[model samples]
Target chain A: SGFRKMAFPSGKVEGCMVQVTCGTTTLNGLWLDDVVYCPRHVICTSEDMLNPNYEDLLIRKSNHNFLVQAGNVQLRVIGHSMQNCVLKLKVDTANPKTPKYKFVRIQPGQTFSVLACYNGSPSGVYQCAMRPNFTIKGSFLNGSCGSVGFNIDYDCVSFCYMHHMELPTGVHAGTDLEGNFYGPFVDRQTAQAAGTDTTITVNVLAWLYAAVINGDRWFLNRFTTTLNDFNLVAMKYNYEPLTQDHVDILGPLSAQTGIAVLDMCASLKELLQNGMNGRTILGSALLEDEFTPFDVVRQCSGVT
Target chain B: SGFRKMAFPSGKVEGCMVQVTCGTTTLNGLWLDDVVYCPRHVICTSEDMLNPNYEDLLIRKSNHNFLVQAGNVQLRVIGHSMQNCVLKLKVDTANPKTPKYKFVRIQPGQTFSVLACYNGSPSGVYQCAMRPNFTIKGSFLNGSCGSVGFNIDYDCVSFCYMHHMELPTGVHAGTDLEGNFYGPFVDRQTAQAAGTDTTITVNVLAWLYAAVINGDRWFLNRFTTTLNDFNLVAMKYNYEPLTQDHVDILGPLSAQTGIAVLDMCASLKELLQNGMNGRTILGSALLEDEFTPFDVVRQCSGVT
Candidate 1:
């Protein structure tokens, strides 16, 4: 019930709001408008495909435990008021003299996923609120805070996979200089929960990963073309690994439902590998060859 | 008659040679093998299409005069018995302390064009010659050296023009920190030089410089496509600037000749503007927002 209006930019889009709570502090009225800003890591109206009702919307704090692991905590907010809103958070614990505040923002309907709070970095009780407007949303959902590992998003998961190719398989994706955890995958479970079809997520990513890592340009080239040419088929929902077989027996409504994950993988790969095929505009993501972040969406595109 | 054999790099192509003289020092056996290295600012066999005998080679030291301008001194060498030969030169001016020698190499049968020999930065008289083979080319042909203004090349002239855009209108193309005339062409002269057919030995670089400087992307774009599609035609004899006009004016031999300059411009523009295009092996040049010796060929390329 703690909601408030946020100041909008000169031409802010009409949007909604969301409230977030952690510990004793509460941040209310986080804005989200799908009309502007591409919501990749955050949720926006366009993505509320199911348009989940208020009663059904939920934000859950991961159970990884604060004293031990770096976790990702999701924050779902309101976006009906402003096109965009910034989140400012301050920890409650008294530190070794001076402490700092952390900030994160998101559109309405999507949860604020914390994937970088860590032991040596910003660990304590904290509250989230909208910036400039001064509305307090909530405190760290749990009683405290620590490092939140890699927060994955459906659209950018491919970005992670491509980055993975350049790393040593056994190496940690990242860590604070002399910090904790040598993890390559941060909160895989949280990533799995981010709506990516896990059935094909892990498998397909690794399959393509090996090709690049092993220098198999032959397979990559062919697969890249096939992925580019294939059409994305929407299907009926299925409650299984979504594998292809005589799914005729798997239930009439289960066609597109089962392999939604693989279809997404295919879509993302093609969108990036070959860019828009001139057939559709489902969109694309960036691909990196080293540190250079090249646009996979329009590099080969044309104009005068 | 001063000539000597140069050592070949195992399987070096069969080629010819020439001897050079300036004031007094003589470089023996300069190679001009057509097998390797493109002679842009520095001449090599692949470029000596006319191969006008020894009497025709010419070198003109720039004349903003050491006290007033930027100078580009040209060097024409005759490689000896081997297709490879080195040139050694010494400045004749007996100045303050000690003056040193300068060396430039080339395959037999071509002229060596020096675009830079500064009175400020890299000042002083220098000699050229082959190393290990004990041969001396000659001193600065005209006795002294200053800055060679603009050593032109077909492929990268656009690079030079694009760089020109960043400077003030009246600035010398180049100058010492204290500001002296070590320049190619001043704005007026440069603009004029671009459209006119050059009488220089290589003769075909500037026909399109004005187009780019004056905002002719459409022509650049169209010509770039045409350049990509057309095969380079090698015609007999070479002299004067290469230009393209309506077939009514340009002869059958002029078809390929005129466009070579444009093709070079296109291939070079793509390299720095976009990237490699599918075509012949002529290659492209980089367009840097900053100036580098890249435009000054052979600050890195070599032989003999």
Candidate 2:
């Protein structure tokens, strides 16, 4: 029972379907139980695919067991503050047929605010596949489903601020998805995306789309360790934070619509010289005032 | 004491600059010692910066009481692995002037990799900010950096594939300084910057970049975990490996870059699925696959 040969093309392969071919006649039907696949090749099928134990080759729909903050500081975690309706943050990859991540369940009248921390494609042409700025689950609350509210921007990091265009909110139904945001989606700590967010840029999206189509996009998602993060789809596209690009008009308009998009980041230097990890800056966005504060750096000296 | 305030244009603030002003600050400067301000909002006040407890934070830096991981098992694991690095990841935000982390003194050829099993963002990105990828820090190999030579197609759930970009071959730079790589440079995963010398998608590049710049670019890189995984990068980027983008190419290649990335992976997965995380894969990247793989779900399903 040794490792054998088998391959699949990007667009041609089916979601979660890994065709394992052992030798000539031993065409076993081993498969990824779920859609997950890591860059580190996972050994699901050795000699034959029909071993039936093939499900072990792939990851599940969602791991969801978060270490969150190790050692346990137990302070107010972003998504885990209130003990109400399970509040799960779903990314809304496609229209429907998307995996659902319960960001959190909240009680009625309980102020629920979502502080999203994300980075956009460095080239600026790319945006998040989930809800652009704020659209709830299709059958959210009652009518089919009532969606959640207070989906505001906390922060976003893009690749290059130089070519950085106006922040785009998720379009209701558009080809690209990132619609020019309304008020502000928050932008900061970009520049690095250009130099940083590297790997399978294009294919990542394509495969993700495939995974979503396959029902559990996250299974295929290899990197999502929020502080590094993931999700399911809930709302459609809507929000975008307002930045200098929209200052004159789009700025006010974005805020008015509760949509946001724009790097809240101020300078490039600060990006290079701060703590690699820490707490969330909850608000409409991660703005200059919110990021560069002296204390922000000062406190960052020790265990914080 | 409280959350800090930074300002960009996204509405986090009405202006620019993550200030050091106690009065201007949300509290006497609400930002904590552990915060990493995104570039747009990030601004470490040079003057009036706070100093950290030098001795304690530093003592841990050079104690030589380090924990190393040999083979699939571990030598020792106590507190967080970040502490294992000879030099602390960075200096406190308050005292960037006097910088806390100092380089260490290693013997010849005997360099140590940052020891830790990355759970995701926290360990991944933060480690990248502080360490260099594919680098050897002992006397002879101060910065023998290498890249994780794989391409990912970025997507929302497969976000790592899309946003984070390529890692450099060796001794690279970082963009993040935050907890999560959501910001550009703050915690950009270091792995992506060292692109594996191959052509890939834009989104994939994005995620690869994010992977490296965010943290433990090298030490925690999954590519390193699998030995031939190294060859894949060599083949893809360095062309050192005989077989790269395609495993079939390995047969006649110069160095015969060993196994295909997928081939090595399949072997590893097969072992794990068969009730083994300890057995070694060809060339053994698991020793280097910093990210942790969970089988909890599989166990729960009782499919041994």
Candidate 3:
């Protein structure tokens, strides 16, 4: 009785609307041209196996009263349809800013499974939805989604594939101390003939900051004070133009900060070529919190 | 005129005795059987090139007024002899305990070069002597060596050949806090089929002490406390049966201490196989500042 199909005078086919209630939220999904369109943040997947089409489509209620644990949540929506045909599901939380999400394709006899809120808050109630293309969307909420509780397990693996280079383990996207977004891949690319690619570079000042965080005083004392000393260390340790393997072996914080340090070196080399002396460059600090040489390198290299 | 040559009634070759003054000390060196034997803690070498025999051998005075710097010492005794023949020199300091030392072989036209007091006090005046086999001996002294000063530069290279396995860089022979001579190879070997080769091993308690020194809290937490936890870390990091490459990468302090940890693991494994349970083994500590399980492992493994 909730399904509605209408036809106009021109005799074109009109889609039907199906309403389903999950917990306290009711969603209206559109079924048109053999595809189901779920409301924003709601997800749907087929459960039947034998039939190839949605000839006997039905919305089934799922038990959502299970105790919530860290990093886990129970599913709220389940669907049943004909088998052999692919059931497309999509979610578009892109309209309003939302956390990243993913949806699993349902096989015959399996209910819908969707995981959302990657790189988001650790635990919270969240609004969830799935569209027709195996995509889902979510927005974190202040309270539980009716009786369903959810949590997120944050790891570096979630940030993978967002950039050209794979982010090293233990590094993640987060806002810096100044509330600005900082990430391994942020502002790291430059346009080239082969498409967009960036020279692997490091920012010395940023590396210093990270070194301070890691309490690597030895590295700090050796690389910070003078250009000659820095150059000597660079030559001895092969610091400038580090090989990929060396970069990979660095801890996550080191790798991220070292990228900034490399970026600075590339700029410093250019400035030296452009008639700047090491004394002026090494003696100055650009900001109160930052060293001068590092700031100049970052400025010359066009690194934010 | 001060040289003496005497022959016995049996007509044996009784060599001459020559007295030379170095700084304020006069040493009597014996020229016997074509070999030069300097008094205890004195070194001599050849300085003449053309003649093969000691036809024009003389003791020459060397200037010893140079300002002393750390790790550098000037030679006190200088000898000149006929060319083309080897000047075999010997010094006997084995009568009393002394520090380790080495001497360079003197070529036809070269003077004596000796380096002594390895693994000893950094800066000191010491008695130095050379033996025939390119070996020297040293004993650290409170005062200058008869108006000549000396110092020692210590590095891991000095301890290289003392053990079968090459000690990694940064590790050196030294006594532990308790005045016990703790070295990388001390008491590490057992009579085996391979000619007294020691199985590469580590002692857990010893490693804990080293870890405390290094402040490697992450590693300390993961590998200590329980046998299962230790086993998990061991398997994940391939801790037991560690390859040589892995051992080589460890820091000098870690490597020395890790040897003790591996030794404990070996003993623990044997006990587990021989009807002992892990609970009893892991629950006990041997003595103050030592974990019980580690003590049991050391006791069972016959590691002191």
Candidate 4:
């Protein structure tokens, strides 16, 4: 009927169990979700408790969407997602058709580079795309299974860069069972044990963290809209929507990170409100960045 | 060549109302303007209310625009607007003799601490700004009128530190009505009632009620960029920019609260695409954020 609440089934509401699953592997029991309620924490899995035997050495590969530009002329693409993998810079303005189409393999989190040698006119257009053949088969198995299961391959997809310049490449792109940009796991047995919603927020946070630390304004600004499409966790947990108040509060936070966090939050709320099913809520309101949470501003020494 | 849209007419709607005046005291209301088809709601002016009324014990005084910091390294300017009632450390860190200026007196929701002997290397940089003597006095009194009609000033300001480490206090600088943070009243009798896009989003939710709570963000992130210059409703309608898809549906919702609704929705899209703008597009098929529209997210439990 409304935002569903979760219960700690066994009546034994002891230390919390935090698990993350993919393919056949699940990372479990970390003693931390929002707040570290219990200091006694250990990593393990449901099927094989008391020990963590899973590890994933995922190969990193990604498609970078780019924007091309010439010095004096102002040519820009507006309101569209970047999805370029190959490019052709009308090299050497002398003869537009004389140049070849140069293919680029943009590594995850890499910035855009200069297209080619400049010509006297110094004005030309460039187009780029992933051209299907350039497949570097990457996996989100940065952390994987060691014992029971093999590598889990959630198909990979390309994402665009928001700004004219390249943004930071902190965390690599990831996927869930549904092949969603940031969906949940594929491990059936461990599915029930993992912290579904936390998985999404944490991963999203990591990517966002990269953007923030790198000062990727284009990425921060544009990625916000993408969050709109993947706010399943926010909806399930019935996260709040954006508002003027939120807008006002934003002015005071750190520039880029502040901007990013708020953008993601607003978007997640919108997603939760308008789309998705009647899913229950997950995770508490505890978001973190490279730094710790500012639990008590007044608690800081100087002012008082 | 423009962000377009803003109109006001007298005979359009009928109602007892209040209007705000720059030098005068008035607030008004009107009947028909926005496509108000679903009339389950009614409009009325202030004087016509039943209860003699509800008032607050307020003080008329505020100095916006601040810059705070701890010692030379500049930990932060905890507790202050750029108002600069006072400041310590040094007018100029390099040469204490170069300038003789010391100030202080910050309101709540500000940060930055002192250092050393304070051991606690203090471990803080605290970016506190409101910058500039740039004091654009603003008050949260969207509606104000006394017996004969006297403007009430509820100096409501002092919100910063929703984040952990304090960041830079950017342009605590901006203004619209003759260049004041909070200006514009008395355009007509029903002038004040007109939902300034600022209203719908800010107050409606409260920081977007969390940049997700009273939860509220992206607007906060952006409008932060924007507030450096403009702050209509992203902090105006000012509240409630999202919901269960409420935030997402905000896009499709009839555009104050409405105008803001669409503006935010559209702005979000624009940010995802181009840069930023304040345009309002009616209803459309494009609803991202991993959501469709409550148009079919089942329904609510308590709301209906």
Candidate 5:
């Protein structure tokens, strides 16, 4: 015997009701089991719908996997017969020192913030499980609610810059549910009321790229990789002295941002032309002065 | 015998000097043949490099084919031996009645505006052919250069509204090489001086989507298709009348734009909920009052 697959081609079908029956034998089905064929319901508050390629950011890697940036994400349920489809969420913290996870239940059209600083740590994997379970065709249907699950992965690219603190005080750094980060203010209310400020609400590398030089996709990718590598090295060495190679890595960035590296820290204009040197400086000082928080030093870098 | 291939690996090689010799016999080569391995050099003045998915818009379909939107585009030359690679550009106009093309020579780092209102016409296709050609090993390499050509296709999505005139006067609508469209001023100087105005410089469907209700990519795509279909129909009938199906296609847009269709045009807010009807309206009146230039009607549509 062959199998018949009924598909809901449009709109949200994640929580729609489904029923299977063969003469006297009857079975109920959970929406989660059919999730593979349904579209993932995601809404980004800050997304520019008019942007030609906005779809690229919302592409789903798999039925259960999603790749997203740090932002406010709304996991919604729509369409017919979705009243019973409540969503359960579990968030794992990324902090290595104190690993933790939290559980919460959400209604059909509720929203949550992902990858934002939470409980003194950044968000890691977000697991969402649907409520309800059923089985059919001698397959033991109610097995962990069709074993359906959604794993959302994101990056903490956007940051809220506190004036003096290296890290935010508590979990709230004046970031809203829409994922708009605000800072350089005394408290969350002040920051939120002030709205988004490029100087204070910064995406470290992204802001730097916008302020400095420009290039094609390949060049931008290369620049991002170089900076990421530098961050890793600085972190690994406990912010000690760096070699010439590492120092050269920061030359272009330093020149553009007007942040001096070493003995070459004479005139700001000259540093841009002559580049930087590795000797006569410690990595700790450089990291502290230029990159510990990045935005803090960026304000005085003269590029704004 | 096996095949041996040599690649430049990186940078611009469009006009690099190449020499191949077998004993005393010598043969020169052109860089165009190796273009498939080389990167396409394109720079957009208005492109936001910091956007996470900016690369999607810059993806090259093929070595010789590019898809870009209305903007100031710079066809650049870089790396070693690009001095001799002067670029020759031919632009074809999209005007139906008077079709024509023009040719010009460009040095290494020059910029040009594409898809802008030029000579009473929007741009159709931009063909760029490189100079210097050579051959080797019985293969006619110098045959009309590497026969190497670049076809840049763009859209006239950006518009400059010139108050009363249906179209711009003589093509100069105060748009810059960076693709910034301006208008509603007395002339080019006033338009350019005023800078970009969201009310006047409009990307028809894009601006509409932004000012109205929001949705995911699928919904946005559907909305775009509907509006484009309505435009085609409106243009085909010489602005006569629309069937119920055609009128229904515009229901959402009309509601969002606040430009009502037929009897539904009452108490602006009511149209948002009641939708629209097809009878008792001429296509010409509807289009002229709302869709003809779009922005004109949009200004009065109660959506700033």
Candidate 6:
């Protein structure tokens, strides 16, 4: 998991564990990823929903892998007992030292999934040692292709990022790395294995993922409202991959969130070509452009 | 990590687990704390390191623990079978139920760290949790209380980051969140029973990290170098406190770095008053600023 890895801070939403400032308290602020937006009203615009036709061309080209570029990554774990419910990726090999292929970790009370990507690099072509934890799973955008894109390991970070205008087909991005690339987007009933917690709505329960069990079952049917707002705003703010003109609006996150970075090829054409709609936590993954200040923002605080 | 965070992305790196377009094979090339750039370095200047005089002033002002606005936090894990190493901040136990503590997972053969931070809102305050395969080590600098900082958890992607900075004298800006005015830099070797290896030189290790520690400790010293650079650059660029222009120059990394934010009264006065030889890496815990990003970069890339 060294080349590409991540972890959760202490833990979150589990018995007696929580993430907090050294000495203060934030009530139910829902520190999604590291972008701590206090469950504000969902912000969306035409940009958020509209997927360009040409964009799909890019997504198809990218295949399944997202472009942030961090081979190893970590996450913020401030909630209580983050360890209890967190899922982590690590290696188990000994001889010659092989990566155990660790992926992502989910905080307690959260649901997540992973997607497999077959990548060939100087490090002997990336391989998938584990299956995704989801209902509907597939490898790459083209099913069994080896071109490879994003190889992610995730915990309950799934959803659909669909195309709105340009193309016809779709590409799904999940909340977890190595998560579902295509999905049926399981809601309340779908997340049975994690728990049958009726107390929390499917949406809320969805956030309580730890890791994907089977890549296949992992599903995505919805788009996080949070993703929508920033999508439109980022592009409106910085089309040139602009400056630190503003905090969140100043980094690569701006670019990824600005437009649907998924390519427009194969079935994904419509999604990225014209208008695309898909489920994903930007804090959870990257876009077509690239991810920088990724560690500084994405990993520590989980704020894109 | 979603609030539209943005940074530049260049091209791509060849042969790696994940193909990133960011174009920096080494974390130091991106932006690391304490980094001693041998040549071309794409450094980010932050406010925390740039304007601080916290050693004597903030301490004298009783501001030992300065509030880290929004930046990366890091924790290091060393040794074998050190998996499940979780860190907790004694500060986050808000009460019985909704407790909050910072934490991270420790894996064998790898040092965990992350790059994370917030751009605005309540600054973060945290500490490590003690668990199996985990030990929180404290760092000391200036032979006294001058500054305290370290990286927290590792990333799910590639590398991890650790706090890196100088502990000035005096409470230039006492503890920001908690009443604990001092931040102790950590030691992973002792924590993991791996026999801390500070003895490891910065040169050969820097280049040979890949073949040596598998890039685990790749940019260890560079992080320090960058932090030092951040500080010196801040002074040379904009040493004043809280100015629009100053903030503009400092950029996002500054706010996240916790550099100018918590200036050790002694360190600040010494530098502002006496000046420096150039930029010296004050051996100590990374201020909130450096640790966060450094950790993230490490966790994301496995380049310690």
* Candidate number of the best TM-score: 6
- Writing each residue's lDDT as its tens digit, candidate 1 over A73-188 gives 23322221111111222222222221121122221111111111111222111111111111112212211122121111211210010000011211112121122212322312
Model 4 spans with C-alpha error above 4 angstroms: A1-286, A289-304, B1-84, B87-122, B128-236, B239-265, B269-304
lDDT of 4 at A174: 20
| lDDT for each residue of candidate 3 in A112-184, tens digit (9 for 90 to 100) | 1111111111111111211111121222121111111111111101111110111222112211112122222
* Model 5 ranges with Cα > 4 A deviation: A1-209, A214-252, A256-304, B1-209, B215-252, B256-304
Clashing pairs in 5: A134-A141, A135-A141
Model 2 deviation from native, Cα RMSD in Å: 23.2
For all candidates in order, the CA lDDT equals 0.21, 0.19, 0.24, 0.21, 0.21, 0.21
Best by DockQ: 2
Over the stretch A79-125, how does candidate 6's per-residue lDDT look in tens digits?
22111111111112111211123334332213221111111111011
Q: Residue B158: error of model 4 in Å? A: 22
Q: What 10-residue stretch in candidate 3 chain B is worst by lDDT?
A: B1-10
Model 5, B42-121: lDDT tens per residue? 21122322231214433422212322111223122222211111211112222122112212332211112111111111
The superposed Cα distance between candidate 6 and the true structure at residue B144, in angstroms, equals 24
Worst lDDT 10-window in candidate 2 chain A: A1-10
Better of 2 and 3 by lDDT: 3
- Candidate 1, residue B280: Cα displacement in angstroms equals 31
Tens-digit lDDT track of model 4 for A1-304? 0000100011011111222222343222111112111101112234433232322211111111112222223222222111121111111123221112212223221211111011111000111111112111111121211100001011111122111110021112222111122222122222222121122233233333332433323323333454444444455663323334333433334353556555655444453445323221111122221111111111111211
Q: Using alpha carbons, what is the TM-score of model 4? A: 0.18
Model-by-model DockQ, in order? 0.01, 0.03, 0.00, 0.02, 0.02, 0.02
lDDT of 3 by residue, B1-304 (tens): 0000100010010112233233333333323322333321222232322221233222342223111111122123233232222222322212121223222222111111111111111111111111211122222121211111111112101111110111222112212111122232221222211121111223333333333332323222222223454465445432334344323333343444554444434443443334222122121211011112232222222220
Listed in order, each prediction's TM-score against the native is: 0.16, 0.20, 0.17, 0.18, 0.20, 0.21
lDDT of 6 at B279: 26
What digit string (tens of lDDT, one per residue) describes model 2 on residues A1-304?
0000000011101111112111221111101122211111112223422242223322321323211111112111122110111112122122121122212222111111111111111100101222222221010000100111121111211110011112112111111002122223222212211111112111222222222222321122122221100111101111122223223322332243332211111111122123112211110111111111111111122111
**A77-164, model 5: which lDDT tens digit per residue?**
2222111112112122221222122123322111121211121111111111111110000101111111111111111111111111
lDDT score for residue A276 of model 3: 29
